[PDB]
Amino acid sequence: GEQELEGLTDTTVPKRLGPKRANNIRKFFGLSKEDDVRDFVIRREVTKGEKTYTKAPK
RNA sequence: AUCUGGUUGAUCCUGCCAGUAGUCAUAUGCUUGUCUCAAAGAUUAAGCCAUGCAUGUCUAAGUAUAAGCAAUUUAUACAGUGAA
Structure with missing residues (x-):
């Protein structure tokens, strides 16, 4: 909506694993x-x- | 490959009841020092069951970025070991 949430809209948790299959990297x-x-x-x-x-x- | 006691005052028979040995055949009674070998909840109730165990598994060779360890080092894809 329009306002902000203290724990839910502020942070950004990064992902855990990049790609492995060769075409799936490209x-x-x-x-x-x-x-x-x-x-x-x-x-x-x-x-x-x-x-x-x-x-x-x- | 065997027989002995018991019917009558006395004798010969038919005849059954005691006796006598065996059992990897089970209990039970009193005893019991040694070596070797050893069955053992079948009978009655295929009745009932507290707790723990009895089925898991990896090689150089299917899948490892463990925020594992070892660090040890030629190795910028990875290469040692190795939980889930």
């Missing part, structure tokens, strides 16, 4: 046919102590 970026996809994959970083690692899907 849909998400709108890339063309002749483009390599394996340089266009979302990566997630995680660190315990001082070890910055990288999770990335197969």
Whole structure:
């Protein structure tokens, strides 16, 4: 409507997982046919102590 | 491959009732030191049941971004192990 809601209209929770199938990635970026996809994959970083690692899907 | 006691004052018979041994055949009574081997809720009620267990499973080789761990390092797709 017109007014705002304190917990329901203000925040934005981000999604948990990007795409995995190769054609299903090119849909998400709108890339063309002749483009390599394996340089266009979302990566997630995680660190315990001082070890910055990288999770990335197969 | 065997027989003995009992009918009459006495004797020969027909005849059955005691006796006598066996049982991987069950209980029961009094006793009971050793080695080996061992059945065991069938009979009566295929009656009733407290609690716990008895069916789950992975290799180099179907699916891992665990906000798992190991970090260890050639590896920017992923590659070690590995819950759900």
